[PDB]
């Protein structure tokens, strides 16, 4: 069970950086809309990482 919990923590941590990269891709290609929306969603992952 500990292994499982740490794996979930790692996956959430990885998705945080994934959505940061998506925001950067929005900055490169899209506009402030997608760039800000990426971090808007990333809020939840940052919450869950610590909560876990």
């Amino acid at each position: 069970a500990q292994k499982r919990s740490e794996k979930q923590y790692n996956d959430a941590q990885n998705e945080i950086n994934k959505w940061q990269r998506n925001a950067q891709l929005a900055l490169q290609k899209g506009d402030e809309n997608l760039a800000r929306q990426a971090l808007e969603r990333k809020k939840t992952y940052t919450d869950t990482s610590a909560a876990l």
Binding site: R36, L39, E40, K42, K43
Partner: protein, 40 residues
Amino acid sequence: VRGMNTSSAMSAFERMEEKVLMQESRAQALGELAGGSDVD
């Protein structure tokens, strides 16, 4: 119209509307009771 009760159908419709709005408000209050600069 919302504020007059000449028609029974509207009477019933508005009554149910208010009942449901009150139910949702109850849920929200219960949420509060028991408990964007950074991304900007």
